[PDB]
Design a protein around this nucleic acid. Structure first.
Length: 62
DNA sequence: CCTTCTGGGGAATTTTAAACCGGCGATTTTGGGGAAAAAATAATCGGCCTTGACAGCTGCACAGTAAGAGAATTATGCAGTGCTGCCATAACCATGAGTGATAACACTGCGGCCAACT
């Protein structure tokens, strides 16, 4: 979710929100980031998997 | 005391009712042909009901990978030059065969001359 552009600490950055929703329990993990690079995507997925205490058997992206 | 009447039983015969089987007369059913009607299917027509769009417009940003465009560098194929050797061709003479030429008549093409119209 591209939140928009904000002046954080006098620096203009493009804030983005990463959301991971479980399908059966409808849990929700989220985290804010300054970039949408493959590295950031993979790290946010690691954070989601740690938060849910495991990895799913299927993950749906766009 | 005796005679006659009657009744029962076994055998023979007759009639009528019932059931089967066959024969005869009638209707039904199957097949084919021709006509008529119904229904099914497809196409075409009119019209009602409902809603999308028209409201400035869409170009840019990011993500990743791949392609490509331009310039520099490298590899390679062509070309150029010299020296030596071998093969091709060409030059001459003879003989045979093909075609270009020559004579004659007939038909046609081109240039010179005459006349008619504007």
């Amino acid at each position: 979710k591209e939140v928009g552009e904000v002046v954080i600490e006098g620096k203009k950055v493009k804030l983005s929100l990463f959301v991971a929703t479980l399908g059966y329990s409808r849990m929700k993990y989220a985290v804010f980031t300054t970039s949408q690079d493959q590295e950031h995507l993979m790290e946010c997925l690691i954070q989601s998997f740690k938060y849910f205490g495991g990895v799913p058997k299927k993950v749906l992206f766009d």
